[PDB]
Amino acid sequence: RPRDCLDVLLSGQQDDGVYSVFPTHYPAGFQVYCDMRTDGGGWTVFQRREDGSVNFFRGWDAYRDGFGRLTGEHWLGLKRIHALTTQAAYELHVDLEDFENGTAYARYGSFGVGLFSVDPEEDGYPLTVADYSGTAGDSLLKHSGMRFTTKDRDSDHSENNCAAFYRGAWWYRNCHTSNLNGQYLRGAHASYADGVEWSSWTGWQYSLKFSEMKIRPV
Amino acid sequence: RPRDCLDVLLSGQQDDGVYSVFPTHYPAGFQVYCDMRTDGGGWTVFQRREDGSVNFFRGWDAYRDGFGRLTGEHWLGLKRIHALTTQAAYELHVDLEDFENGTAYARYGSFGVGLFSVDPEEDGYPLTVADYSGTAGDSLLKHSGMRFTTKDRDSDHSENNCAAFYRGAWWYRNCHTSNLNGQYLRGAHASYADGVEWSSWTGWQYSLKFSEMKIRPV
Amino acid sequence: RPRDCLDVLLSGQQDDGVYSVFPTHYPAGFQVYCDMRTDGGGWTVFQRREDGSVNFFRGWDAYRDGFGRLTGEHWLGLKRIHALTTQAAYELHVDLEDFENGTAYARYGSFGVGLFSVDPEEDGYPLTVADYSGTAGDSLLKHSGMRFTTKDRDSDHSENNCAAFYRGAWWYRNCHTSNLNGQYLRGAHASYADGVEWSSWTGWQYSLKFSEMKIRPV
Amino acid sequence: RPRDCLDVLLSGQQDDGVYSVFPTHYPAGFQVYCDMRTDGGGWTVFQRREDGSVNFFRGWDAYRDGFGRLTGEHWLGLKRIHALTTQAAYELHVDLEDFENGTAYARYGSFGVGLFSVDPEEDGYPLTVADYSGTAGDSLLKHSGMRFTTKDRDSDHSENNCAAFYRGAWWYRNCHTSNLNGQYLRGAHASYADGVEWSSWTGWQYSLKFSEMKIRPV
Ligand SMILES: *[C@@H]1O[C@H](CO)[C@@H](O)[C@H](O[C@@H]2O[C@@H](C)[C@@H](O)[C@@H](O)[C@@H]2O)[C@H]1NC(C)=O
Ligand SMILES: *[C@@H]1O[C@H](CO)[C@@H](O)[C@H](O[C@@H]2O[C@@H](C)[C@@H](O)[C@@H](O)[C@@H]2O)[C@H]1NC(C)=O
Ligand SMILES: *[C@@H]1O[C@H](CO)[C@@H](O)[C@H](O[C@@H]2O[C@@H](C)[C@@H](O)[C@@H](O)[C@@H]2O)[C@H]1NC(C)=O
Ligand SMILES: *[C@@H]1O[C@H](CO)[C@@H](O)[C@H](O[C@@H]2O[C@@H](C)[C@@H](O)[C@@H](O)[C@@H]2O)[C@H]1NC(C)=O
Ligand SMILES: CC(=O)N[C@@H](C)C(=O)O
Numbered sequence: 001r002p003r004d005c006l007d008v009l010l011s012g013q014q015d016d017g018v019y020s021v022f023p024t025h026y027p028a029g030f031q032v033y034c035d036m037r038t039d040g041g042g043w044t045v046f047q048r049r050e051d052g053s054v055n056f057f058r059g060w061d062a063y064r065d066g067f068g069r070l071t072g073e074h075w076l077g078l079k080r081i082h083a084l085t086t087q088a089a090y091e092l093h094v095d096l097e098d099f100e101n102g103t104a105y106a107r108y109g110s111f112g113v114g115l116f117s118v119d120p121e122e123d124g125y126p127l128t129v130a131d132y133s134g135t136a137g138d139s140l141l142k143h144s145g146m147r148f149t150t151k152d153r154d155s156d157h158s159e160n161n162c163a164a165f166y167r168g169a170w171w172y173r174n175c176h177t178s179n180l181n182g183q184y185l186r187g188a189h190a191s192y193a194d195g196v197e198w199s200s201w202t203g204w205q206y207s208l209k210f211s212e213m214k215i216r217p218v
Numbered sequence: 219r220p221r222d223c224l225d226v227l228l229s230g231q232q233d234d235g236v237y238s239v240f241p242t243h244y245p246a247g248f249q250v251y252c253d254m255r256t257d258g259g260g261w262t263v264f265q266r267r268e269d270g271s272v273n274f275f276r277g278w279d280a281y282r283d284g285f286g287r288l289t290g291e292h293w294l295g296l297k298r299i300h301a302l303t304t305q306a307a308y309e310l311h312v313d314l315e316d317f318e319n320g321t322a323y324a325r326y327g328s329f330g331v332g333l334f335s336v337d338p339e340e341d342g343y344p345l346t347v348a349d350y351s352g353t354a355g356d357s358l359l360k361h362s363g364m365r366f367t368t369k370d371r372d373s374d375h376s377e378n379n380c381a382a383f384y385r386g387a388w389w390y391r392n393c394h395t396s397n398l399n400g401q402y403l404r405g406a407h408a409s410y411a412d413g414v415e416w417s418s419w420t421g422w423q424y425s426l427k428f429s430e431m432k433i434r435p436v
Numbered sequence: 437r438p439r440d441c442l443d444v445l446l447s448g449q450q451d452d453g454v455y456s457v458f459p460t461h462y463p464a465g466f467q468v469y470c471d472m473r474t475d476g477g478g479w480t481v482f483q484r485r486e487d488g489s490v491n492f493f494r495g496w497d498a499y500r501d502g503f504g505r506l507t508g509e510h511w512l513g514l515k516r517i518h519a520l521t522t523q524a525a526y527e528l529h530v531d532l533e534d535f536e537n538g539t540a541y542a543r544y545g546s547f548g549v550g551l552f553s554v555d556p557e558e559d560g561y562p563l564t565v566a567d568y569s570g571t572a573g574d575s576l577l578k579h580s581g582m583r584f585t586t587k588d589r590d591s592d593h594s595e596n597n598c599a600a601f602y603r604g605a606w607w608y609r610n611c612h613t614s615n616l617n618g619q620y621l622r623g624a625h626a627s628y629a630d631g632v633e634w635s636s637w638t639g640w641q642y643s644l645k646f647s648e649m650k651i652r653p654v
Numbered sequence: 655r656p657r658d659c660l661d662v663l664l665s666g667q668q669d670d671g672v673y674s675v676f677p678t679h680y681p682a683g684f685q686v687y688c689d690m691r692t693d694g695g696g697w698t699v700f701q702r703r704e705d706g707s708v709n710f711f712r713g714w715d716a717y718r719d720g721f722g723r724l725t726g727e728h729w730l731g732l733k734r735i736h737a738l739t740t741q742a743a744y745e746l747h748v749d750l751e752d753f754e755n756g757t758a759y760a761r762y763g764s765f766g767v768g769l770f771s772v773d774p775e776e777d778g779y780p781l782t783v784a785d786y787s788g789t790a791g792d793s794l795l796k797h798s799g800m801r802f803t804t805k806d807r808d809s810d811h812s813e814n815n816c817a818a819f820y821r822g823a824w825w826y827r828n829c830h831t832s833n834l835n836g837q838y839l840r841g842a843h844a845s846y847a848d849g850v851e852w853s854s855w856t857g858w859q860y861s862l863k864f865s866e867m868k869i870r871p872v
């Protein structure tokens with residue numbers, strides 16, 4: 001009964017792929033994609049963009065329960081990300097790729113979703129994130145403490161709905177420096193900040209080719 | 219805590235009948251009918267037609283949760299079929315009988331439902347099936363990759379609802395070569411392909427007497 | 437982790453009262469009242485009438501989930517009765533008392549609720565009951581094979597709703613010989629068969645003072 | 655798998671903070687705040703007021719499922735309080751503070767919520783409380799036996815809704831002597847008994863600065 005992808009790795013499973021994990025407060029467990037290569041391996045993936053094949057402009061229930069496929073574009077679901085990040089102290093790794101085959105990454109030494117929320121869904125799965133390092137620059141620390149906002153559930157610090165306006169779903173403030181669940185607009189676009197944006201690397205008008213968000217215990 | 223009917227058999231239960239199984243991600247478990255005779259035994263039944271006593275023209279929730287009785291005509295439910303087929307690599311056995319006491323079978327070396335779906339219900343319990351052998355001919359490989367479609371939830375490649383039109387529930391494309399959840403029309407019928415059809419054996423206008431779909435780990 | 441009140445007794449708990457039980461397919465478990473005196477003890481109570489303090493003219497959800505208190509008048513809930521009676525072969529004991537301090541009982545060697553139902557709620561928690569003995573006479577064997585009917589969910593063999601007409605909830609045919617979830621009308625009443633009726637003992641116009649329905653493995 | 659904060663303490667965790675507990679009939683478990691200092695420690699917190707940062711004028715579902723954060727103002731949820739208080743015999747400790755830095759406490763040797771309810775939600779999570787001692791005086795024993803009432807679900811002994819009228823959620827009679835889930839009105843207020851009231855200490859027109867309700871096995 002591994003609790004995450006690091007337990008899977010330490011048990012002797014060295015190959016990238018889909019494995020069963022059993023978080024402390026999710027004993028039924030569920031399947032995840034494990035990255036067993038990045039910085040020694042043991043990363044549990046919870047988000048991937050790579051080809052714009054999956055619609056990410058989804059409502060609250062979809063972002064709670066998850067959508068897409070573990071072998072392609074997917075969102076694991078905030079209920080699962082909560083179950084994972086509350087059972088130990090996790091770091092976040094974000095891998096990015098542009099349409100010119102360029103790559104960069106952001107590492108956060110602390111990452112959590114609704115860590116102290118009695119009802120994390122009610123409380124809007126608030127983001128805990130700290131301690132940046134990497135090549136992509138920081139585009140997430142400004143989002144620390146913000147609730148998750150979708151097109152049909154607004155908990156941001158804007159007078160309008162940030163998720164509706166920037167066609168995504170994120171821990172929006174007023175509104176964002178990152179938007180990895182945005183529209184797959186494929187590189188440079190005329191529209192403002194409504195693509196797969198990581199502003200610190202490629203600004204507010206470049207939708208990235210590939211994103212992967214994953215967690216490992218520190 | 220057997221995970222399926224093969225575990226039940228290997229534990230020393232050799233009789234056909236109803237047993238408790240406990241899939242990896244369904245730890246509460248549920249009761250299934252075990253076929254302990256076919257090709258050495260250890261088959262978990264998830265579909266049976268035999269007398270048209272049970273209505274199979276049911277909606278999404280019915281095909282998710284299951285209906286009928288384990289000792290007669292039933293559908294185990296896609297949530298249970300998902301839980302079973304994701305915990306190991308399963309083969310599918312389909313037993314068929316006509317109203318002239320003729321029998322045939324289809325064996326598939328690979329069978330799965332929503333194998334990599336984050337939310338298999340959202341994703342429409344897509345069919346994985348490959349490697350045919352048997353006497354009935356192949357009527358399922360064309361359905362590989364298709365989502366499950368009911369009269370009240372359309373995910374097929376038709377401009378209309380295949381489930382509504384052919385009075386069934388299946389991994390419809392545009393529309394089908396098999397329709398084992400179709401109406402129990404009892405043998406030859408004037409209506410087109412809306413019966414218990416296995417086209418490769420008995421064509422598109424013969425509703426079979428008996429069908430049984432069951433799985434065993436390879 | 438006792439599965440029922442017999443496990444509780446055999447573990448060395450000899451006192452009547454409330455205990456935790458953990459049925460095979462209900463691993464979370466729940467509290468029940470255990471009768472540790474009747475015919476050696478080990479009986480799991482699922483119904484009690486004694487003072488008409490609790491309303492038994494309730495809808496489908498109430499009879500699924502249960503109502504009242506374990507220490508007084510209650511219905512354990514059909515989901516729990518299903519979980520109990522499907523994990524082994526149970527007998528039913530029915531204790532009755534009139535308002536003249538007279539007592540009688542009915543014993544059934546076989547009792548079950550939705551024993552082979554894929555979805556027992558969908559299938560209406562059909563009654564399995566056989567092999568009568570006792571002093572009260574038989575008022576249940578005619579109900580064998582019937583689905584459970586409430587005022588807001590009709591699955592009986594009447595043109596009207598038996599539960600609505602006889603102000604109860606039961607495995608109604610057309611309509612009943614027993615009605616222990618009927619109105620607490622307190623002894624003889626002018627109204628026809630809408631009280632706590634056990635017809636074989638006290639006929640169709642006498643609402644009993646006390647009823648208790650309980651199960652033990654054979 | 656500690657069942658409560660006393661198990662956490664006895665396992666060798668001596669620090670105040672958030673821990674995972676696994677009640678008998680809530681095996682998935684959940685996180686709670688443990689008080690490891692008060693009278694030897696081992697107290698499971700289920701309510702805290704301290705700064706009026708969280709809205710406590712919430713409906714039935716919120717008081718069932720819980721709200722706020724474990725590290726600040728929160729309500730653990732009646733489903734969790736039921737799961738905790740039914741697995742053993744618990745005492746209640748209530749810590750109070752006024753806006754003049756004055757403190758007092760109420761100890762109850764017996765505390766429970768829906769202890770014998772078949773469906774504690776249906777039954778309205780009725781209060782069991784007895785055996786007062788402390789400095790704050792008794793403001794809860796009059797509430798013993800009363801169901802929990804919210805603005806959108808009335809089970810009190812008033813002709814109006816006590817929760818609506820006194821802007822809280824409590825085991826209201828007609829109506830209250832305590833109201834710790836009332837509005838955070840900050841000390842003396844003109845409005846009648848609609849603040850964080852503990853009448854025996856600070857009367858019906860003083861909203862307390864701090865409240866903490868917590869349980870430990872006797
Ligand atoms: C970017 O990486 C991908 C995957 O490794 C390569 O396919 C790209 O190479 C380009 O496309 C291939 C099919 C071939 O025509 C090659 O000559 C091209 O350079 C690679 N580079 C770019 C610029 O996309
Ligand atoms: C088909 O198989 C069934 C079950 O084994 C048999 O009952 C059928 O036999 C037929 O019906 C029986 C009752 C008897 O009258 C016999 O003489 C018949 O041949 C069997 N054959 C057919 C053609 O249905
Ligand atoms: C029926 O049983 C009950 C419980 O044991 C008894 O209370 C009844 O006794 C009657 O009521 C008591 C209070 C006392 O007045 C006695 O003299 C009565 O006979 C008992 N009998 C009847 C007829 O109810
Ligand atoms: C009440 O307790 C708090 C926390 O210990 C103290 O801060 C209060 O002290 C008062 O405020 C501080 C900042 C300082 O100005 C001190 O001189 C004040 O007395 C303490 N007392 C009161 C009356 O609030
Ligand atoms: C997209 C977004 O939030 N952009 C910032 C810079 C702003 O509008 O103030």
Ligand SMILES: CC(=O)N[C@@H](C)C(=O)O
Binds near residue numbers: 392393394
């Ligand atoms: C039933 C069905 O789909 N029949 C195929 C042959 C078709 O209509 O093209």
Ligand SMILES: CC(=O)N[C@@H](C)C(=O)O
Binds near residue numbers: 602610611613629
């Ligand atoms: C109450 C009930 O069903 N009575 C039977 C005898 C009948 O009406 O036929």
Ligand SMILES: CC(=O)N[C@@H](C)C(=O)O
Binds near residue numbers: 831858
């Ligand atoms: C608030 C409350 O219930 N007060 C009591 C004294 C009453 O009104 O009778």
Ligand SMILES: [Ca+2]
Binds near residue numbers: 156158159160
């Ligand atoms: Ca807003």
Ligand SMILES: [Ca+2]
Binds near residue numbers: 374
């Ligand atoms: Ca269609």
Ligand SMILES: [Ca+2]
Binds near residue numbers: 591593595596597598
């Ligand atoms: Ca009817």
Ligand SMILES: [Ca+2]
Binds near residue numbers: 808811812813816
């Ligand atoms: Ca009222």
